[PDB]
Structures are given as C-alpha cells and as structure tokens.
Amino acid sequence: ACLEGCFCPPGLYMDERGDCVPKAQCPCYYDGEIFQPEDIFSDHHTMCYCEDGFMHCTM
Amino acid sequence: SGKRYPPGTSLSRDCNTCICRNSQWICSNEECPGECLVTGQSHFKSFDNRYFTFSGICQYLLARDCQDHSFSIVIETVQCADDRDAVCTRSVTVRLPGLHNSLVKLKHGAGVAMDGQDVQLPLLKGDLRIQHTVTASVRLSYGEDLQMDWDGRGRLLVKLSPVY
Amino acid sequence: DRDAVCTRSVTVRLPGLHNSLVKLKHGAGVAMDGQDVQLPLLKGDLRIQHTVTASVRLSYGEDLQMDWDGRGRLLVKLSPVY
Amino acid sequence: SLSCRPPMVKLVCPADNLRAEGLECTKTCQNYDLECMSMGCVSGCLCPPGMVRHENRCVALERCPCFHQGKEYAPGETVKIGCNTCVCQDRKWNCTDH
Amino acid sequence: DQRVSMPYASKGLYLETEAGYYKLSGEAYGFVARIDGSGNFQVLLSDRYFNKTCGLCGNFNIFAEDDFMTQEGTLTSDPYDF
Ligand SMILES: *[C@@H]1O[C@H](CO)[C@@H](O)[C@H](O)[C@H]1NC(C)=O
Ligand SMILES: *[C@@H]1O[C@H](CO)[C@@H](O)[C@H](O)[C@H]1NC(C)=O
Ligand SMILES: [Ca+2]
Numbered sequence: 001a002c003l004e005g006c007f008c009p010p011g012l013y014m015d016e017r018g019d020c021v022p023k024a025q026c027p028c029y030y031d032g033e034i035f036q037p038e039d040i041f042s043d044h045h046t047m048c049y050c051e052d053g054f055m056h057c058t059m
Numbered sequence: 060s061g062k063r064y065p066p067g068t069s070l071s072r073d074c075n076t077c078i079c080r081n082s083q084w085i086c087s088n089e090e091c092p093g094e095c096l097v098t099g100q101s102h103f104k105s106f107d108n109r110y111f112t113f114s115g116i117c118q119y120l121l122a123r124d125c126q127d128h129s130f131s132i133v134i135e136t137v138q139c140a141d142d143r144d145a146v147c148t149r150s151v152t153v154r155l156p157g158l159h160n161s162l163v164k165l166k167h168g169a170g171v172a173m174d175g176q177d178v179q180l181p182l183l184k185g186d187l188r189i190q191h192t193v194t195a196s197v198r199l200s201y202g203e204d205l206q207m208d209w210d211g212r213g214r215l216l217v218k219l220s221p222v223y
Numbered sequence: 224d225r226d227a228v229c230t231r232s233v234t235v236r237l238p239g240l241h242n243s244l245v246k247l248k249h250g251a252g253v254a255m256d257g258q259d260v261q262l263p264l265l266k267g268d269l270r271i272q273h274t275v276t277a278s279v280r281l282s283y284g285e286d287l288q289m290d291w292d293g294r295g296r297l298l299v300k301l302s303p304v305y
Numbered sequence: 306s307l308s309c310r311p312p313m314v315k316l317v318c319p320a321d322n323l324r325a326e327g328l329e330c331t332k333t334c335q336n337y338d339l340e341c342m343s344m345g346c347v348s349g350c351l352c353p354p355g356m357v358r359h360e361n362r363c364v365a366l367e368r369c370p371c372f373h374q375g376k377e378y379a380p381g382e383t384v385k386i387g388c389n390t391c392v393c394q395d396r397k398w399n400c401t402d403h
Numbered sequence: 404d405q406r407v408s409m410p411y412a413s414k415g416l417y418l419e420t421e422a423g424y425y426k427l428s429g430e431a432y433g434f435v436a437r438i439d440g441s442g443n444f445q446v447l448l449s450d451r452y453f454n455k456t457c458g459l460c461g462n463f464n465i466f467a468e469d470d471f472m473t474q475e476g477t478l479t480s481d482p483y484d485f
Contacts (some may be wrong), residue, residue: 005275014276032177033149034168042138044116047477058479120339131340141474152342162342170261175344177261179252 013053026053090221095122097134097215101146106219114146121151122217128156130205134215148213155201158186165210169197230295237283240268247292251279309350312363318346327351333358334369334396371398 008020015021016034028035028050035041035050042048048057064070069078074091077084093106101114116136123131131154139147153163164172171178171189180197182189187201196209206218235245246254253260253271262279264271269283278291288300309315318325327346334357352363359369370377371393373384383392391400411418415431427436433449446460454464461470469478471485479485 003275005277032170032172033166034170040140042475044138047473047475058477058484118342123340133342138475143475154340154342173258176255176258177264179259179261182259 023052028053028055030055030057092218092220095217095219097121097148097213099147099213100139100144101136114144116146118152121215122219124223130155130157130201132217148210148215151210151215153199153207155187158184163187163189163199165197165199165207165215167211169195169209169211171197230292230297233292233297235281235289237269240266245269245271245281247279247281247289247297249293251277251291251293253279310363312356312365313350313352315348315350316346331358334364335372337396367396369396371396373398 008014011022012020013023013026015026025037027037028039030048030050035055037050037052040049046057046059048055050056064079066079066081069076071077075087075089077086094104095106096104101112102110103113104110114136116138118133118135121132121134133152133154134148135150135152136146137149139145149167151165153165155161155163162174166172169191171180171182173182178189180190187199189197189199192198192209196211197207198209199205199207204220204222206216208214208216231249233247235247237243237245244256248254251273253262253264255264260271262272269281271279271281274280274291278293279289280291281287281289286302286304288298290296290298316327318327324343325346326341326343328349328351329343329345329347330341331349331351332341337357352358355367356363356365357367357369358364368380370379371382372378378384378393380393380395383390384398385391386400389401389403391398393399409418409420409425415429417426417428419426419428421437424437424439429435433451435447437445439445448456448463450463452463454462456463457472457474462472464470471479471482473479473485
C-alpha cells in the first residue's frame with residue numbers, strides 16, 4: 001500500500017547502517033552474502049559481479 | 060637484539076620468560092598457543108609459523124582435530140578479481156560434533172548462519188559464543204580452547220591452545 | 224498502577240512446519256525455537272521481515288499476517304477461509 | 306534423462322533426514338578420510354557404500370592408488386625419499402625411520 | 404615521466420615517423436604499432452604468437468567467433484564486458 005513512516009528522497013536508497021545512499025554504493029545480496037559495490041567474483045565456470053545494487057551473473 | 064640488559068632481569072616473550080644469569084639466558088620450554096592465519100588473497104600461515112601461498116579454487120580443509128574429532132574447519136576459496144592470481148576467501152564452515160553435530164557458517168559479510176538460519180549476535184549457546192568485536196568483525200569462541208575471527212573480506216584467524 | 228496491563232510478548236505456533244514455535248519479543252525481535260534470528264526469514268511458507276525498519280511482520284502463506292509486539296500493538300489478518 | 310550405469314545405483318533425498326549426504330559428498334579416493342559438508346543430495350547416481358569414484362571409473366575395491374608428486378602408485382609400490390624406502394600398504398604411505 | 408624528443412631508439416624500439424604518420428617498431432619483439440593524424444591505432448603482429456596473444460584485439464587464430472576469451476578464459480557473447 002501507500003504507507004506512512006520515515007523515508008528519504010527518491011535519489012537515495014536505504015543502507016543497512018541507518019544512512020541511506022545513492023545506488024552507486026548500494027551493496028548486493030547474492031545468496032544472502034552482502035557484497036560490496038565493486039566485487040568481481042567467480043568460480044571456474046560462472047562469472048559474477050556487483051555493479052550498482054544488482055548482481056550480474058553469467059556462465 | 061643488539062641491546063644490553065643487566066643481570067637478574069627477566070624479559071618475557073609472548074610464549075614464556077627468560078632471565079639473565081652469567082651471560083646466559085635461562086628459558087622455559089612450556090608450550091604456547093598457535094595461530095593459523097588466512098589473509099590477503101591466498102596467503103596462509105601455519106600454526107608452526109610457516110608462510111606460503113596456494114591459489115586454488117575449491118573447498119579446502121583448513122584445520123581439524125585428528126585423533127578425536129572435537130571440530131573441523133573448512134575454507135572456501137574463489138577467484139576474486141579479473142586476474143587469475145587473485146583467489147580470496149569467501150566463506151568458512153565450522154563443524155562442532157560436540158553440539159548437535161551442527162554446522163556454523165561465516166558469510167562474506169560479518170554474518171553467521173547456523174544450519175541455514177541467520178542469527179542475531181550474540182549467540183550464547185552452552186559452549187560456543189559468537190559476538191562482534193568492534194561491531195565490524197565476528198568472533199567465535201568454543202569452550203576455552205578455540206577462537207576465530209572475521210571471514211567477511213577474508214582475514215580468518217584461529218587460536219588453538221596447547222591441549223591440541 | 225494496577226489498571227495498567229500491557230502486552231510483553233506473543234507466541235505463535237505452526238504445526239505445519241516442524242511444529243515450531245515463533246516468539247515476538249518486547250523489542251522488534253523474533254526468536255524461533257530459542258534462536259534469535261536476523262530478518263528476513265524466508266522459510267517455505269512463513270516470511271518475517273521489517274515494515275518501516277521499526278516493526279516486524281509475519282506472513283504465513285496467504286491467509287495470515289501479524290504486526291509488531293514490541294510495545295504491544297499486535298494485529299492479525301485472517302482471510303475468509305477461516 | 307539417463308539411466309545410470311549398472312555398477313552404481315541412484316539415490317533419493319529422504320524428506321526426513323537432514324543428513325542427505327548423497328551426490329554433493331561424492332567420495333573419491335582423495336576425500337574419503339576427509340569430512341564433507343552437505344545441505345541435501347541431488348538427482349545423481351552414486352557408487353555403492355563399498356566403493357568410490359576414480360577418474361570416471363567407479364573402482365570397486367579400496368585398493369586405489371597412493372599419490373605423491375601428483376603421480377599414481379599402485380598398492381605395494383615403493384618410493385625412495387632420502388635414505389628411506391616407503392610403501393603404501395592400504396592407502397597411506399608406510400616409510401622407514403632411518 | 405620524462406618527455407623525450409623524436410625519433411628515439413632505446414632498448415630495441417625504434418620510434419620513427421613514416422609517411423607523415425608515427426610508428427613504433429619492435430621487430431626484435433615481433434610487433435609494429437603506429438598512429439595516423441586523426442588517431443587510429445594499428446598493431447601488426449607476427450605469426451610467432453599464433454593462438455596466443457589474448458587481449459582487446461583477440462587471439463591470433465583462424466576463427467573469428469571465439470576471440471572473446473576473457474582474462475579468466477570464458478567465451479562471452481557480449482563484446483563489452485569482455
Ligand atoms: C606400517 O605397516 C605396519 C603393518 O603392520 C603397521 O603396523 C604400521 O603402523 C605402519 N606404519 C609404519 C610407517 O610403520
Ligand atoms: C590453439 O590452442 C589449443 C590448445 O592448446 C589447441 O588445441 C589448438 O590446436 C591450437 N590451435 C587452434 C587451431 O585452435
Ligand atoms: Ca580470432
């Protein structure tokens with residue numbers, strides 16, 4: 001619904017530490033694991049990175 | 060170490076003490092705890108103060124009690140950058156057969172997950188305590204003969220007392 | 224006063240999953256079977272997550288909701304199947 | 306689908322036992338003495354309890370070789386490290402104390 | 404960091420100008436680079452590096468479809484993340 005509470009402006013998104021930040025340093029939550037805004041990351045076969053909040057995986 | 064001390068003094072290493080008598084330090088040989096250290100990309104330190112490097116990508120066994128089976132630790136390495144010579148630690152898995160045969164897991168953040176369930180810290184069960192240290196790093200403490208450190212960005216440690 | 228009797232905690236019980244026992248504590252905290260838990264908690268059916276980051280919300284299936292029992296403002300949503 | 310080969314039999318995760326150590330904990334000759342993690346099994350086909358995998362071949366007996374310098378050694382074969390001989394009786398190398 | 408003049412010939416790399424356009428020859432090491440007036444890099448490279456030199460100009464093999472093999476080694480369909 002259209003709820004009531006404490007938000008921050010649309011350019012800013014909420015971070016875990018109470019502050020809210022733009023989507024540049026908004027971490028990724030792949031498989032529960034909290035990855036930093038720039039984390040290149042790969043097993044042998046898969047290839048994944050965190051750009052701006054989303055986790056871009058490939059194969 | 061290139062400096063003079065009078066006789067009768069007692070300087071102490073971290074391990075034990077030594078006293079000067081007739082230009083000859085007398086020293087005890089009582090054991091003192093070890094520290095296996097993972098850090099950086101792939102840089103290990105053994106308990107016996109050996110240093111080396113092994114950039115493999117699998118689930119490797121870091122440590123284990125091997126005459127009885129009080130515990131077992133399992134590192135999990137992954138490539139960690141564009142280069143091939145960059146293999147950092149993502150997670151570590153601890154296993155305590157003394158309590159439920161449970162399975163603790165230290166995740167890539169400061170997070171912990173017992174048996175799939177995420178957990179708020181502290182976690183006083185009977186033996187093992189898990190709590191933050193600076194509020195930016197987890198610390199497991201099973202009994203009085205085992206410690207750990209944060210495996211978020213890959214700086215695992217251990218403290219094994221001389222009973223092992 | 225004696226005419227002041229507030230709610231401290233509420234205990235939920237789901238026989239459909241393990242015969243577990245959820246507990247909403249006097250903060251915004253939750254405790255499944257003695258174990259404190261970080262939110263969210265996607266198990267199969269029940270989801271527990273914050274709402275404004277100051278209030279918990281249980282959601283078992285599509286026929287049950289809850290609300291925060293920190294300072295005592297419990298709610299429920301029961302769909303007409305009950 | 307693929308009906309797996311005769312020498313091994315398919316497994317199924319039971320819904321009751323959390324200890325569904327099936328396909329994920331595939332015991333080869335390296336990781337037999339080693340203890341493995343497992344969440345649940347998979348829809349794979351695993352060797353019987355009395356044998357293990359060995360380079361795309363489920364070697365039956367527990368006679369599989371004893372590695373050193375990443376090279377095969379059949380049981381009974383010896384190696385000379387220093388002034389000592391050392392033989393693999395069962396699966397671990399058996400050296401001399403000279 | 405020290406700006407040098409031109410031509411220049413140190414360490415077996417003759418840094419000349421040919422046809423009004425700048426050249427960097429490395430025949431001992433097996434390459435000839437150059438740039439034009441507008442700015443158009445070019446790299447002539449020997450057959451000694453066949454199915455080798457992997458980089459932003461791809462491997463020197465016969466095929467033309469497999470020559471996005473990343474620094475890990477991964478045939479990627481995208482010409483951009485490569
Ligand atoms: C070697 O083999 C013998 C066989 O009886 C065994 O008793 C012994 O423990 C083994 N270890 C060594 C290296 O002696
Ligand atoms: C390139 O290298 C691969 C691997 O060594 C080899 O199989 C292949 O024959 C070489 N040349 C071609 C034609 O791809
Ligand atoms: Ca090509």
